[PDB]
Design a binder for this molecule. Structure first.
Ligand SMILES: [Cl-]
Lengths: 250, 244, 111, 231, 195, 241, 235, 243, 240
């Protein structure tokens, strides 16, 4: 018994390709479209909620996840792989940062830790790479707002705006025409909803769309008062009703 | 058992070559070119970003050029994720030396240890090698300014001027042509940019597809300064040499 | 606090002649001021014409004799039934005793 | 064919080929015989040399004062297994002051051999053993196969051409089982048994190996001039 | 063990170390050299627990010599002293700590300056113009506070050292059987034979 | 083609071992169904005992994981019992560590995470089972959560699993289109069990005796299975209407 | 590929059988046992004339009463010799006596099958172990990577073994003197060797009760070579 | 293909061919049965007499676990012994912690989980035995049969080996003809008959019969072997029925 | 831990991984050792497809193991660092316990033992390196030259070469080296070493390295001009 697979399952082919990483990116291509747009005073991340059955309650399945009070994540590819990555990402923000410095990590460094975890699945013994690409949006005092993409290889890139998954090629082109460096958060939400309608086929409402923002601090979502320096989470998930309000003036 | 699925990453070919090392070098030859040039009064590091998109955030970005300590930096060619694993090890190693001896680590010592780690992945453990080649640029009070390169085999060598990644064959011929020993930093800056401009697979070399850095003694008296160039500073240096 | 040692009394005596040797010992076994047994032998035939006694703390004495008897058995198994000479037995017993240098067998041994 | 790479693989008909190949090593081994009465148990073994300049490979090993075995196949594997038996017999004496029952000795060997047939990396033992002994329930003879199967018998034989002696003993069953209180006659029957497995070669003085254990007899081995009596 | 002293002057570092090895009521030896050369321009004297001292000294010597062969280069006195301090700082929280006190005298060839470091068994390092370990300091520090000048010659340093040994031979309870004196300068390490 | 033997990616980004574990799910040829009431959650499954020599009382694919949580399995019994023992242990540890009963959805996530690991780690095969967890959660109310060999999980208004699952699924969809609500608007669990059996009969097109079915019911503070006579009592009530 | 401890269909271990082929490629080693002593001789076989032949060490001391000769992948023998020496000295420490030659040989052979998936492969070298003890007198053993050892009156191993063994079958008798054995090893080595035998490319050694294990000088062997050539011409 | 070369690999059907191959080894073995009765269980097995040289009554195949459970198996005999050794360890630790002797359903799952574990990795081989076992606990009598996959159920009657179909048919008649129940002493007799009837599928070599039982009234809830007068009586009953 | 037996026997009795490691040595740059009456000289080829090199900082081909012993090699450069490091550590460890520096034979025996261990250990491949080890024993003036190879075998040589085209330079040394009269001086020994490399090298410019070891820790490396004088002198005598 015991894990006898102590050798790499991802290796270089004669042409120089890393097969399993390439094949993981192929799995991401098949995945449902998700996107992110960076505004001057915030960031928006969005995706379609592909329901597996109409008897399924799609509210119980969250594709957009809070990592820290100021950082959120969305994905394209394999859902189960994403779920465990969120668990690991939430924990590493504490163990390797909050428990040392008494504050949450800046976006770039949390992203860096998630990338490390995904790189190790590319080299360690007896494991396949993760079959997901992540989009991580967040804010921190000294860097402001930022948006990052993390690929199965472990590579990450900062973006003004981008899309991943099914119809990413068309969605990226749409975002290039609309993005400028003076966009206000509400303008970015509007463009996010427009871009997503192109890749969605069936119903397009607040129950089939999942959307969250990184914006102003929310004191009403803190849960307590009395400490002036603690002002609340910048991450907020838009409600089903809040989405439909914006779909009328579309 | 599991023998069936073992690639045997650390074996010899009948010709006495290491399959996985050779294939990793083949991977690196498709990565963006990076150039290092050593002058008498400093060192230049120049690298080409891999085909950029207009919506990429260029200023808050780092892909090619990384700081190891205040006196040493590296240019990367290969898988970035693999490189960051090695960079963090190198950063820690530098601090271990400083803690032990109360002196900044000599460049070669850091290069040797990082190269020794790479070597290990080719002899034991059954894991794939790191698909990365480094250009090391640094200063110490023994040898002064130094350029090194290491590759997946764990072999390292010293250089006056060198390139890694794509089109090294063409790049090396061009550097060999115009390099001379009494060269100054500002001349080396020009040579680095001119070489990338001629070897690039792109239509034209622009500020948004480059990372640039210098290591000079151009601080105030007998001390060394690392300058990682900002986007606007690359835009200016590209105009100053008349490439754009 | 638990004391792992005790004293079971008794005494032993060995004399050697030209073509013989004797190993004697009394048969009384005690703790404090009480008699445990009037006849409890502590001189043993260990094979290969070797007789042995380990006198002091009887639990350690019995353990040592038990281990040496076993050592003779394995000496035969490993070296083609060769007879264990008295000098070789002595050296072997040294290693048995010194092996517990930092938690000693509380006995005086004679063969 | 495609299912004989290791012990951990079953064939489509439910066979373990590595275990069967281990069984084959026994068939190439020199013949050895075992038989018993109600008072004694006897091993007889034909020893094999490399050439006329070499010694004759010893086939019989003592395990305790009351137990021992003979071997056919890979000799180093017999050394490992006999050593294990020596320890188990010994543990029983030191801890319980009890002579290990010949039946338990069989059960212990079965379970040690089995573990090597169900895990990756290992291999089956490549040797067969005939264990004789005298315990609290009288004389015994066991046959060990490296498949794990252990069997108690009145008499048997393993090795090359063992079928001749095995047939003979099957005929002689009623005679030799009642050779009680007579060692030399029980051996004579065993020496006649092993003679049914000889071809072109006959039993010489540095060729024959005999062992005996019984009611008032410790396990002892006879070689050289001590077996001249029986030729 | 017992007496080890050190004086840094203009151009050299001078180390003096007692020659006696005493166990019980017997002086077993009167010519013991309580020092090891770590590198051509670095010397270390030592005092403390029996066995521990030489074992530690030789362990450090091996490590510095290993470094020298690997890099084809000599570590600075500052670098060597920091390595030694860290080894003792590790040691103090081990199951059985090294009970050894050391002085390190070296000549930095890059700076062209003599350097003297005092390090105790806890790993407490200080750079000093003059140093001592054990009860010696209770006499020599005040003496050197009075007579020492920073610009002295090697000869002046030796006379200053004679004054210290004389005071110790007058007021110390134990017979330490004199000292072996060694000089560390630009030309390396040499021993004064007539002291 | 060793990429089909262990859980590594194929050129088209697929995991064949996971896909084949899904096909093992139907090896028993049994269909299961779960619905929610106002106060309860009912799960039913077919019970096929072909051999006359079997003790029918020991043939079951429904498991009591905790006092509050029940689980029905679609797939071979060895893997089914493996999953059940782990779930029981996990639910027990949760209560000891965190001081309250493990919710149905949290246990589902945990078992789904374990399943995910087998899809990523090579030495462990996936279990060829689909696990349906049911309870009346003290916060969320009546709950149905389902796990598969891919490591996927989600909550359901109602659900079905097995070879003829699609027929049962659409049958349930068509009812909830009509009723316009998320559950069975019924007071007693007895009638919710009756609804479940009625709609399984319609979708599968077969009649059931008392020994052809298996029923588990979750109410506030307990999950329990029904006896043959409890089901017979329920079958009689359907027939007399 | 396939497991390292795999059986062939004929009931043999692949890796053990393949290591036996490596030993057939090795240089010749011969041993002869007499009542006056045991002689060990080897072919040095230098790969080039520039190689200093006296650095070729294929005969080796284990203890004063035990010596050893090797053939095959000779680098593999170092840890076997290291184990043998430790076993011999350790036994003397534990029992204040000399260890029997057979017990030494059995200890070395215990290392042999300690390979698998312990070391990664069997040894690729065979050993001739020669010695003396009080119980069984002068002895010669052939130790293989299978874990098996045979006692021999005489034995040859290496490339010229099957031809040399057939010669040893005819020449050996139970009354050979030590001098007769020395000449016989030289004679048979000269027959199977490629290059012409002399004191530089062959080496002799012996073990006697009185003087223990001794490797002969090149001067001493040269005279035995001259004595051998003269005796063959003399009839 | 190649899906059948490694344990724990799913075929495109969703099958583990290595387990199915282990079942072939079980089908090759001798016949063994189990009969559940009024207040207990009865076990029996066929022992092929390969040669005259086999000592009668001295190669025992039925095994006891704890003091109240009996186990018999068909297939690779060593594999069965490994499973019983584990069963004994499992039963000992249960009694250690909980004081009471291990219940039969509890014991059944201990063996089941252990056998199932040997279908999870390619570094182990599945068990080459089907095991019939059972006994008496606080809730009465229980009979079980466990297969190489780890699958087990409770049984009124059970059979495995080369003559399993013959034995199954004979078991089904007893279940139909005795709805109220079979007595322990009757079940011993019937077990003998069924082994003799199942021997028709293995009739080259003649055989030796071996029976054991656990009964609340007849053996006081403990596992015992059937010997002497009760065994010969059961043999004679069987001999009368074949003629 | 990764366990795979990578070095195993083949049907014909060869260990292919060890034999393929020898091919890596054959690919490496040529290295030669020649010992005189009172010295040993180590010569090494450096390939000239690499211009723009920095020779101050680039790893030298001959390494000091201790102040009295040196090591050169042919094969994989990265592999050789691991052997050199282990050797240097053993050198200091020997001085510590024996209170005497290593003999050249002992240091060679250790390095060869390490190489052998990597031929029958699980999870590792053999070293793609053969070494020449030269020096003088403590308080001894007799020159020592040893050679090791991937299998683990080692031996002493009057003169030897390893690496690419080593068979050509071995041929040269076999007819030009007299055992009865080794190069009597330092000059004679360096010249014979340079001559032997000139059979294979190309230009005698920055392609040849020469290191001279004399008794009592007297080791020095020659510069370009010093070596170039030997090259110039040899060519003028050749035109005859
Ligand atoms: Cl989890």
């Amino acid at each position: 018994m015991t894990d006898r697979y102590s050798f790499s399952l991802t290796t270089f082919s004669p042409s120089g390709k890393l097969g399993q990483i390439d094949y993981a990116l192929t799995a991401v291509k098949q995945g449902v479209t998700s996107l992110g747009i960076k505004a001057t005073n915030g960031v928006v991340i969005a995706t379609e909620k592909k329901s597996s059955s109409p008897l399924a309650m799609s509210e119980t399945l969250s594709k957009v996840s809070l990592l820290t009070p100021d950082i959120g994540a969305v994905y394209s590819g394999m859902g189960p792989d994403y779920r465990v990555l969120v668990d690991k990402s939430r924990k590493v923000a504490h163990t390797s940062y909050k428990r040392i410095y008494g504050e949450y990590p800046p976006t770039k460094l949390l992203v860096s830790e998630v990338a490390k975890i995904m790189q190790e699945a590319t080299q360690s013994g007896g494991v396949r790479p993760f079959g997901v690409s992540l989009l991580i949006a967040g804010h921190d005092e000294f860097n402001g707002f930022s948006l990052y993409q993390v690929d199965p290889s472990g590579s990450y890139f900062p973006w003004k705006a981008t899309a991943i998954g099914k119809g990413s090629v068309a969605a990226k082109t749409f975002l290039e025409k609309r993005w400028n460096d003076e966009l206000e958060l509400e303008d970015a939400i509007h463009i996010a909803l427009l871009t997503l309608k192109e890749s969605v086929e069936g119903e397009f409402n607040g129950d089939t769309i999942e959307l969250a923002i990184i914006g102003d601090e929310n004191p009403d979502l803190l849960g307590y008062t009395g400490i002036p320096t603690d002002k609340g989470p910048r991450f907020r998930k838009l409600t089903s009703q809040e989405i439909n309000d914006r779909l009328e003036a579309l | 058992g599991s023998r069936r699925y073992d690639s045997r990453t650390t074996i010899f070919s009948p010709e006495g070559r290491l399959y996985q090392v050779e294939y990793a070098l083949e991977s690196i030859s498709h990565a963006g070119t990076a150039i290092g040039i050593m002058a008498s009064d400093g060192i230049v590091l120049a690298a080409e970003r891999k085909v950029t998109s207009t919506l990429l955030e260029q200023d808050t970005s780092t892909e090619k050029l990384y700081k190891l300590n205040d006196k040493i930096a590296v240019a990367v060619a290969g898988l970035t994720a693999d490189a960051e694993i090695l960079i963090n090890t190198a950063r820690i190693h530098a601090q271990n030396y400083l803690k032990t001896y109360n002196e900044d680590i000599p460049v070669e010592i850091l290069v040797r240890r990082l190269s020794d780690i790479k070597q290990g992945y080719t002899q034991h453990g059954g894991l794939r090698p790191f698909g990365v080649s480094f250009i090391y640029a640094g200063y110490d009070d023994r040898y002064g300014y130094q350029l090194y390169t290491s590759n997946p085999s764990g072999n390292y060598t010293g250089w006056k001027a060198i390139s890694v990644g794509a089109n090294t064959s063409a790049a090396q011929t061009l550097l060999q042509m115009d390099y001379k020993d009494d060269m100054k930093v500002d001349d080396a800056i020009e040579l680095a940019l001119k070489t990338l401009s001629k070897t690039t697979d792109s239509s034209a070399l622009t500020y948004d597809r480059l990372e640039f850095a210098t290591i000079r003694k151009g601080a105030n008296d007998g001390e060394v300064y690392q300058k990682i160039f900002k986007p606007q500073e690359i835009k200016d240096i590209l105009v100053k040499t008349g490439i754009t | 606090q638990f004391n792992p040692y005790g004293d079971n009394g008794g005494t032993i005596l060995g004399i050697a002649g030209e073509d013989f040797a004797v190993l004697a010992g009394d048969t009384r076994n005690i703790t404090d001021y009480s008699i445990n047994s009037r006849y409890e032998p502590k001189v043993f035939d260990c094979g290969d014409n070797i007789v042995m006694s380990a006198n002091g703390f009887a639990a350690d004495g019995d353990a040592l004799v038990k281990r040496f008897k076993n050592s003779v058995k394995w000496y035969h198994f490993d070296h083609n039934d060769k007879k264990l000479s008295i000098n070789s037995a002595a050296r072997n017993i040294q290693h048995l005793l010194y092996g517990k240098r930092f938690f000693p067998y509380y006995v005086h041994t004679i063969i | 064919n495609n299912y004989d790479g290791d012990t951990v693989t079953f064939s489509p008909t439910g066979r373990l080929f590595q275990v069967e190949y281990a069984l084959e090593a026994i068939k190439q081994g020199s013949v050895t015989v075992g038989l018993r009465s109600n008072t004694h148990a006897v091993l007889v073994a034909l020893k094999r040399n490399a050439d006329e300049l070499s010694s004759y490979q010893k086939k019989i090993i003592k395990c305790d004062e009351h137990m021992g075995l003979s071997l056919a196949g890979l000799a180093p594997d017999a050394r490992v297994l006999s050593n294990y038996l020596r320890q188990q017999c010994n543990y029983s004496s030191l801890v319980f002051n009890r002579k290990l029952a010949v039946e338990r000795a069989g059960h212990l060997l079965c379970d040690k051999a089995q573990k090597n047939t169900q895990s990756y990396g290992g291999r089956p033992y490549g040797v067969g053993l005939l264990i004789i002994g005298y315990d609290k329930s009288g004389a015994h003879l066991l046959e060990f196969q490296p498949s794990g199967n252990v069997t108690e018998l009145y008499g048997t034989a393993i090795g090359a051409r063992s079928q001749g002696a095995k047939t003979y003993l099957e005929r002689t069953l009623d005679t030799f089982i009642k050779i009680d209180g007579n060692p030399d006659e029980l051996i004579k029957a065993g020496v006649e048994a092993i003679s049914q497995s000889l071809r072109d070669e006959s039993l010489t003085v540095d060729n024959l190996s005999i062992a005996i254990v019984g009611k008032d007899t410790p396990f002892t081995i006879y070689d050289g001039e001590a077996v001249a009596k029986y030729i | 063990m017992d007496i080890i002293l050190g004086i840094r002057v203009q151009d050299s570092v001078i180390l003096a170390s007692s020659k006696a090895v005493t166990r019980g009521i017997s002086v077993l030896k009167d010519s013991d050299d309580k020092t090891r050369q770590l590198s051509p321009h670095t010397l270390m004297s030592f005092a403390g627990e029996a066995g521990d001292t030489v074992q530690f000294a030789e362990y450090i010597q091996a490590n510095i010599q290993l470094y020298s062969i690997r890099e084809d280069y000599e570590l600075s006195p500052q670098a060597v002293s920091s390595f030694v301090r860290q080894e003792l700082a590790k040691s103090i929280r081990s199951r059985r700590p090294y009970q050894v006190n050391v002085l390190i005298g070296g000549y930095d060839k890059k700076k062209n300056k003599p350097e003297l470091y005092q390090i105790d068994y806890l790993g407490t390092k200080v750079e000093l113009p003059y140093g001592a370990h054990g009860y010696s300091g209770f006499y020599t520090f005040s003496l050197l506070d009075h007579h020492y000048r920073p610009d002295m010659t090697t000869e002046e340093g030796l006379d200053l050292l004679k004054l210290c040994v004389q005071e110790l031979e007058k007021r110390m309870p134990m017979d330490f059987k004199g000292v072996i004196v060694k000089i560390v300068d630009k030309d390396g390490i040499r021993q004064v034979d007539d002291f | 083609g060793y990429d089909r033997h262990i859980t590594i990616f194929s050129p088209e980004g697929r995991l064949y071992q996971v896909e084949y574990a899904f096909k093992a799910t139907n090896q028993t040829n049994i269909n299961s169904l779960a619905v929610r009431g106002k106060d309860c959650t009912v799960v039913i499954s077919q019970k096929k005992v072909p051999d006359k020599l079997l003790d029918p009382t020991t043939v079951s694919y429904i498991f009591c994981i905790s006092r509050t949580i029940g689980m029905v399995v679609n797939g071979p019994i060895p893997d089914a019992r493996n999953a059940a023992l782990r779930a029981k242990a996990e639910a027990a540890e949760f209560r000891y560590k965190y001081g309250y009963d493990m919710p149905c959805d949290v246990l589902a996530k945990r078992m789904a995470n374990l399943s995910q690991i087998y899809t990523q780690r090579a030495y462990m095969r996936p279990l060829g089972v689909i696990l349906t967890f049911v309870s009346v959660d003290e916060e969320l109310g009546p709950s149905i959560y389902k796990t598969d060999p891919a490591g996927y999980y989600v909550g359901y208004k109602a659900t079905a699993t097995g070879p003829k699952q699609q027929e049962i699924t659409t049958n349930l969809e068509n009812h909830f289109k009509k009723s316009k609500i998320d559950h069975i608007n019924e007071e007693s669990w007895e009638k919710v069990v009756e609804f479940a059996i009625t709609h399984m009969i319609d979708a599968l097109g077969t009649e059931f005796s008392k020994n052809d079915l298996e029923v588990g019911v979750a109410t506030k503070d307990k999950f329990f299975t029904l006896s043959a006579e409890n089901i017979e009592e329920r079958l009689v009530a359907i027939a007399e209407q | 590929d396939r497991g390292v401890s795999t059986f062939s269909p004929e009931g043999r271990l692949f890796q053990v059988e393949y290591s036996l082929e490596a030993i057939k490629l090795g240089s010749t080693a011969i041993g002869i046992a007499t009542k006056e002593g045991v002689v060990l001789g080897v072919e040095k076989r230098a790969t080039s004339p520039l190689l200093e032949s006296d650095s070729i060490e294929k005969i080796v001391e284990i203890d004063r009463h035990i010596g050893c000769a090797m053939s095959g992948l000779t680098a593999d023998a170092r840890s076997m010799i290291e184990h043998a020496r430790t076993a011999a000295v350790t036994h003397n420490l534990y029992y204040d006596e000399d260890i029997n030659v057979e017990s030494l040989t059995q200890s070395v052979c215990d290392l042999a099958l300690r390979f698998g998936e312990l070391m990664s492969r069997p040894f690729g070298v065979a050993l001739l172990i020669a010695g003396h003890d009080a119980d069984d007198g002068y002895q010669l053993f052939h130790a293989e990577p299978s874990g098996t050892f045979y006692r021999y009156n005489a034995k040859a191993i290496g490339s010229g073994s099957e031809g040399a063994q057939a010669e040893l079958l005819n020449e050996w008798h139970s009354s050979l003197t030590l001098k007769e054995a020395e000449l016989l090893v030289l004679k048979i080595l000269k027959q199977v060797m490629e290059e012409k035998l002399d004191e530089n490319n062959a080496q002799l050694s012996c073990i006697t009760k009185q003087d223990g294990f001794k490797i002969y000088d090149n001067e001493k062997t040269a005279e035995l070579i001259k004595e051998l050539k003269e005796k063959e011409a003399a009839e | 293909t190649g899906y059948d070369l490694s344990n724990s690999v799913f075929s495109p059907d969703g099958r583990n061919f290595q387990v199915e191959y282990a079942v072939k080894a079980v089908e090759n073995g001798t016949t063994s049965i189990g009969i559940k009765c009024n207040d207990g269980v009865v076990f029996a097995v066929e022992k092929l007499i390969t040669s005259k040289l086999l000592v009668p009554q001295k190669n025992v195949k039925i095994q006891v676990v704890d003091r109240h459970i009996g186990c018999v198996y068909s297939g690779l005999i060593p594999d069965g012994r490994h499973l019983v050794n584990r069963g004994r360890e499992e039963a000992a630790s249960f009694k250690k912690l909980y004081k009471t002797p291990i219940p039969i359903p509890a014991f059944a799952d201990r063996l089941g989980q252990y056998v199932q574990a040997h279908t999870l990795y390619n570094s182990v081989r599945p068990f080459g035995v089907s095991t019939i076992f059972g006994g008496v606990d606080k809730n009465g009598a229980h009979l079980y049969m466990l297969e190489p996959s780890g699958s087990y159920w409770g049984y009124k009657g059970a059979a495995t080996g080369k003559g399993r179909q013959s034995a199954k048919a004979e078991l089904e008649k007893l279940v139909d003809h005795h709805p109220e129940g079979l007595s322990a002493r009757e079940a011993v007799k019937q077990a003998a008959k069924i082994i003799y009837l199942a021997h028709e599928d293995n009739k080259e070599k003649d055989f030796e019969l071996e029976i054991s039982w656990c009964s609340l009234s007849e053996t006081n809830g403990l596992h015992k072997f059937v010997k002497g007068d009760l065994l010969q009586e059961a043999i004679d009953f069987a001999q009368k029925e074949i003629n | 831990g990764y366990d795979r037996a990578l070095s195993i026997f083949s049907p014909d009795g060869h260990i292919f991984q060890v034999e393929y490691a020898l091919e890596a040595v054959k690919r490496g740059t040529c290295a030669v050792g020649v010992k005189g009456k009172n010295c040993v000289v180590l010569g090494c080829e450096r390939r000239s497809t690499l211009k723009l090199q920095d020779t101050r900082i680039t790893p030298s081909k001959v390494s000091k193991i201790d102040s009295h012993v040196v090591l050169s090699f042919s094969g994989l450069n990265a592999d050789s660092r691991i052997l050199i490091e282990k050797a240097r550590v053993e050198a200091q460890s020997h001085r510590l316990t024996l209170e005497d520096p290593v003999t050249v034979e002992y240091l060679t025996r250790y390095v060869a033992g390490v190489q052998q261990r990597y031929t029958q250990s699980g999870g590792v491949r053999p070293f793609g390196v053969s070494t020449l080890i030269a020096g003088f024993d403590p308080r001894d003036d007799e020159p020592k030259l040893y050679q090791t190879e991937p299998s683990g075998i080692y031996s002493s040589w009057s003169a030897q070469t390893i690496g690419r085209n080593s068979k050509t330079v071995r041929e040269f040394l076999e007819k030009n080296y007299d055992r009865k009269e080794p190069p009597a001086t330092v000059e004679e020994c360096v010249k014979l070493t340079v001559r032997s490399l000139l059979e294979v090298v190309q230009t005698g410019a920055k392609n040849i390295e020469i290191t001279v070891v004399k008794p009592d820790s007297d080791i020095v490396a020659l510069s370009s001009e010093e070596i170039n004088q030997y090259v110039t002198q040899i060519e003028q005598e050749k035109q005859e």
